[PDB]
Amino acid sequence: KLXXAHXXQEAXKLXXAHXXQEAX
């Protein structure tokens, strides 16, 4: 939820609830 380039995870651009990581 906080962005941070999804911690480097390209998949984050598609959501998927960040794999459960609130940090997204």
Ligand SMILES: [Zn+2]
């Ligand atoms: Zn993410």
